[PDB]
Design a protein around this motif. Structure first.
Motif, short mmCIF file in Angstrom:
data_model
loop_
_atom_site.label_atom_id
_atom_site.label_comp_id
_atom_site.label_asym_id
_atom_site.label_seq_id
_atom_site.Cartn_x
_atom_site.Cartn_y
_atom_site.Cartn_z
N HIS A 112 0.87 -1.22 0.00
CA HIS A 112 0.00 0.00 0.00
C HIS A 112 0.89 1.25 0.00
O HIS A 112 0.55 2.19 0.73
CB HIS A 112 -0.88 0.20 1.23
N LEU A 172 -3.64 13.80 -11.63
CA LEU A 172 -3.04 13.82 -10.27
C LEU A 172 -1.65 14.47 -10.30
O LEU A 172 -0.85 14.16 -9.40
CB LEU A 172 -2.98 12.39 -9.73
N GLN A 231 -0.35 13.90 -3.91
CA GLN A 231 -0.05 12.64 -3.20
C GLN A 231 -1.06 11.58 -3.60
O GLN A 231 -2.25 11.90 -3.65
CB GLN A 231 -0.09 12.87 -1.69
N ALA A 232 -0.60 10.36 -3.85
CA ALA A 232 -1.50 9.25 -4.22
C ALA A 232 -0.98 7.97 -3.58
O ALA A 232 0.20 7.94 -3.24
CB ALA A 232 -1.51 9.09 -5.71
N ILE A 233 -1.82 6.95 -3.42
CA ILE A 233 -1.29 5.66 -2.91
C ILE A 233 -1.49 4.58 -3.98
O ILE A 233 -2.48 4.64 -4.71
CB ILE A 233 -1.86 5.28 -1.53
N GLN A 248 -0.47 0.14 -5.11
CA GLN A 248 -0.31 -1.16 -4.41
C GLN A 248 0.85 -1.94 -5.04
O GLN A 248 0.91 -2.01 -6.27
CB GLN A 248 -1.63 -1.93 -4.38
N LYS A 304 -7.88 8.79 -6.16
CA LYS A 304 -6.49 8.29 -6.35
C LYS A 304 -5.65 8.52 -5.08
O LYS A 304 -4.62 7.85 -4.96
CB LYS A 304 -5.85 8.86 -7.61
N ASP A 305 -6.09 9.40 -4.19
CA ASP A 305 -5.38 9.60 -2.89
C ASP A 305 -5.44 8.30 -2.09
O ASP A 305 -4.63 8.14 -1.17
CB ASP A 305 -5.93 10.77 -2.07
#
Lengths: 378, 49, 100, 63, 135
Positions: free
Chosen positions: A54, A66, A70-72, A74, E86-87
């Motif tokens: 993650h 984006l 900030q994005a996450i 996997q 998307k965060d």
RNA sequence: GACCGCAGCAGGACUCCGGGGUCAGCAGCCUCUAGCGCGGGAGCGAACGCGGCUCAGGGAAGUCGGCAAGCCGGCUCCGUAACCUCGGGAAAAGGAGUGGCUCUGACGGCGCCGGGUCAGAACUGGAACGGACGCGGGGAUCCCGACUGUUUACUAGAAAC
RNA sequence: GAGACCACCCGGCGCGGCGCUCCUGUACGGCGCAGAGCCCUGCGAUCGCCUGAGGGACGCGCCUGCAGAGCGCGG
């Protein structure tokens, strides 16, 4: 009549037949292009899959939704046991594809590697390589045979024994994955690189540069003989149906009086050898480093082994490599990684800002065990 | 040769509920699931009255 | 030779239908004893049969302390097991006592 | 990293975890997990439940 | 065009046959969905709308008489099913809702009631300016 | 428990007597008494059935049609339309409570004894109460027959009789 | 890590215990100078303290206690 409303034939036909993969584990089949004059590098490595993460990252993608946000994303961690070159294999370009010439093993084959030849080690003859070990180790037979490979064979490969003991897998029998020297200036240069590496450890950090895209090839997870509804994705027939809703209504038309190859029917739903492509490697690092997964944001040492342990995997003793994206295959499964054949032209630059180390087992609110002793104190 | 007992079932628990019902502990509107006429006949109060 | 072991019935009845939990448990307590005792005949005291079935036929006690005393020789090797009563299992494991 | 606090459990929620919800009164409440959320749907008072930090504060174990 | 910008797909929760609430001061009490614009339907697929997807809705008997018996473009502001931006934050709105917008994006009435999701704001600006809060 | 269905056949055969507990109940769900473990057993928990259970968001958009599921329900207490053969509709519709404890009042006999029924309160239960069980979904009309009744046993239970 | 039987990946397995971590939400019991009130000198649904307790686990690190690799069958 005809099809009336138009739909699609569910399920890619290229992947047929959908059968238990005969090959023991992922096989290369195709290796990256030679491109003579390139930096002399090795193309592939073998790892064992571990639990997912993650990771949070920053996307510097011009003209994107984006961009600068900030994005996450996997990523799946793969333990990389350091490999050892056990032999050099030659291939000659020939009228019938590739025919091999003069494979040479090392003066001493590694002890895990020896285990591979026998089905059981303790209850076995253990006579393999007896003539060869005596034949070589004087550094003469090795030199002349390597010379033959250099003179009569253009393509050179490193047979590599991987060490299963370092990782928690109970395999205990080394698996052999071929790697190919690529980019050597001339045929001679590739062989000399391999000989230096003969009987020498190579870690993934050497094989795959950080932020590059690589291909994951593995025997995929399976569920056994499955019904058409999951095996092929056919729509469930109406609830009111004699003989059961879950099944294709018509397996062929009367005039093509047989079952067509494309017609959907029950089959083993798994264990197919499958390759994904162009998946970036976010972090390549030694697991030994106490701060291998630390970040400037982290403000604590932060180590790769997650709280409570990687689920259905061990302690990832060394060389963890994380690939963004989910690689094919269940945990504890051999996955060959190779330099990608057709990388995505536009790649977001990789800037990991945090990596989650919270307990994969259960819902874990503790990134490190110490903060958890702190929360519960006395 | 032996003869065992009737193995009579417990009437201890029933005893307590019936004594508390005498004080009205279990007479809540939810507990009764029968019509008020059945619980006490509407004719019966009149016959006594 | 007497071996006293803790036998997780719950870790044995898992993987079998609940309606037949108790019969599978008795049979499981007969398979496990044979491996530990290295014998070929297992005789269960009627007292163990009470204990395993005490809860019911669907759910059984999680663990039963069993005293496995091998009483067989002359190539008969019958191994007798009698349930031992303990309050609870903390540091409890096979605890072989005695010798031939 | 960035850690918020639950609107029920009051346990720090690490990034990427938890369901964030917006009520009729235009206020965001970040639920910790399914458990923080399911106990909040029926509004079982956080004080009554002993796992929430709020009860620990009231019972004075937190002080 | 009128909806302007690029939206990362968010999980879509409202299919056709859904009476989303209406928060506008235009007085449409409730809107029933008929279709979602730009839907290429796969066989037997009900068309579905996410937060900020222009949908054509018909005002019900409860709503004002003039807007009834007509297809009106609307933009969904709130979806109950949780959606992952998307965060990586997963956010769920309390009640499904919509605002009636012009092909241009001018609302039928000025006020937007209650929360407005951030995806609705990027695609449709007038909602963003009048939003009491952009959650 | 042996009758009759080619048979030691989930079928058809008339009555007699019928304990406790929750409950309105000869109900359902447990239980003393009384019987008794059935054309066998073990693995294995694939497809696919067959008998249930649950599903984020929306909900009939599915379909010939809400087929099937689901919703509702017990009790108490208010509130109960249009129409109407004024008898009904009507449980119309629509709400509120219900648990366990601590108690207080109404009624047959003080010289001690009747009986648990109802009200009325406090105090407390993760914001739970008919907590299992038994146990209406509701309204708007239209078409035929008034209805209670009878029907083609083994394809039509109706508008037919 | 594969499974209808098989086949396949692996192997001195495993059975118990110990830790960790997670799941659930303060365990039984003891105590109280908490408790609506009735009342003999006690009854009481709960309440608090002990007790982010107790219970449990299929994931994970070990394992000190047993153990675990045919004096089968082929070759």
């Amino acid at each position: 009549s005809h099809r009336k409303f138009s739909c699609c034939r569910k399920g890619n036909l290229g992947y047929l037949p959908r059968k238990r993969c005969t090959r023991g584990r992922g096989r290369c089949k195709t290796f990256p292009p030679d491109v003579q004059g390139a930096p002399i590098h090795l193309t592939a490595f073998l790892g064992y899959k571990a639990g997912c993460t993650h990771v949070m990252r920053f996307i510097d993608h011009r003209g994107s939704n984006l961009h600068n946000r900030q994005a996450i994303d996997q990523a799946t961690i793969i333990d990389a046991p350091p490999m050892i070159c056990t032999a050099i294999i030659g291939y000659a370009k020939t009228p019938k594809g590739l025919r091999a010439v003069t494979t040479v093993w090392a003066a001493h084959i590694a002890e895990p590697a020896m285990r591979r030849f026998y089905r059981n080690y303790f209850h076995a003859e253990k006579t393999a390589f007896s003539t060869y070990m005596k034949k070589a180790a004087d550094g003469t037979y090795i030199k002349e045979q390597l010379g033959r490979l250099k003179q009569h064979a253009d393509v050179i490969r490193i047979v590599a024994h991987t060490q299963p003991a370092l990782t928690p897998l109970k395999q205990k029998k080394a698996d052999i994955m071929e790697i190919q020297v690529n980019g050597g200036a001339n045929v001679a240069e590739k062989v000399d690189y391999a000989y230096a590496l003969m009987e020498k450890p190579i870690s993934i950090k050497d094989v795959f540069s950080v932020g590059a895209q690589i291909d994951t090839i593995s025997i995929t997870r399976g569920r056994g003989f499955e019904g058409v509804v999951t095996r092929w994705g056919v729509t469930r027939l109406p609830r009111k149906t004699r003989r059961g809703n879950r099944k294709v209504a018509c397996i062929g038309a009367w005039h093509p009086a047989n079952v067509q190859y494309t017609v959907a029917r029950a089959g083993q739903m798994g264990y197919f050898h499958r390759t994904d492509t162009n998946k970036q490697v976010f972090m390549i690092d030694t697991a030994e480093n106490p701060r291998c997964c630390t970040t400037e944001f982290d403000l604590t040492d932060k180590s790769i082994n997650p709280v409570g342990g990687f689920v259905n995997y061990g302690r990832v003793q060394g060389d963890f490599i994380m690939i963004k994206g989910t690689c094919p295959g269940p945990k504890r499964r051999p996955v060959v990684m190779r330099n990608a054949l057709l990388p995505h032209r536009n790649c977001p630059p990789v800037q990991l800002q945090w990596i989650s180390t919270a307990s994969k087992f259960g819902h874990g609110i503790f990134e490190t065990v110490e903060e958890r002793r702190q929360f519960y104190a006395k | 040769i032996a003869k065992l007992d009737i193995k009579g079932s417990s009437r201890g628990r029933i005893r307590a509920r019936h004594a508390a019902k005498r004080l009205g502990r279990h007479s809540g509107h939810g507990k009764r699931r029968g019509t008020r006429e059945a619980r006490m006949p509407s004719k019966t109060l009149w016959i006594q009255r | 030779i007497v071996y006293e072991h803790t036998i997780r019935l719950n870790k044995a009845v898992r993987g079998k239908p609940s309606k037949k939990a108790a019969p599978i448990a008795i049979r499981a307590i007969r398979a496990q004893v044979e491996k530990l005792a290295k014998v070929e005949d297992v005789r269960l005291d009627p007292s163990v049969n009470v204990f395993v079935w005490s809860r019911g036929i669907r759910h059984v006690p999680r663990r039963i302390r069993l005293e496995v005393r091998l009483e067989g020789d002359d190539e008969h090797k019958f191994a007798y097991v009698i349930n031992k009563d303990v309050e609870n299992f903390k540091h409890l494991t096979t605890e072989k006592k005695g010798s031939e | 990293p960035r850690i918020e606090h639950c609107s029920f459990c009051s346990k720090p929620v690490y990034p990427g975890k938890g369901i964030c919800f917006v009520r009729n009164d235009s206020r965001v409440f970040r639920f910790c997990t399914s458990k923080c959320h399911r106990n909040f749907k029926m509004k079982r008072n956080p004080r009554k439940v002993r796992w929430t930090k709020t009860y620990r504060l009231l019972h004075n174990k937190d002080m | 065009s009128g909806g302007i910008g690029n939206k990362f797909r968010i999980s879509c929760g409202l299919p056709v046959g859904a009476v989303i609430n209406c928060a506008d001061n235009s007085g449409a009490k409730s809107l029933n969905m008929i279709a979602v614009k730009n839907w290429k339907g796969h066989l037997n697929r009900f068309p579905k709308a996410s937060v900020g997807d222009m949908v054509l809705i018909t005002v019900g008997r409860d709503g004002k008489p003039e807007l009834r018996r007509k297809v009106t473009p609307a933009v969904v502001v709130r979806q109950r099913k949780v959606w992952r931006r998307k965060d990586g934050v997963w956010i769920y709105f309390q009640d499904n809702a919509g605002v009636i917008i012009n092909p241009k994006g001018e609302l039928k009435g000025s006020s937007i009631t209650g929360p407005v999701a951030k995806e609705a704001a990027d695609r449709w600006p007038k909602i963003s300016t009048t939003a009491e809060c952009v959650h």
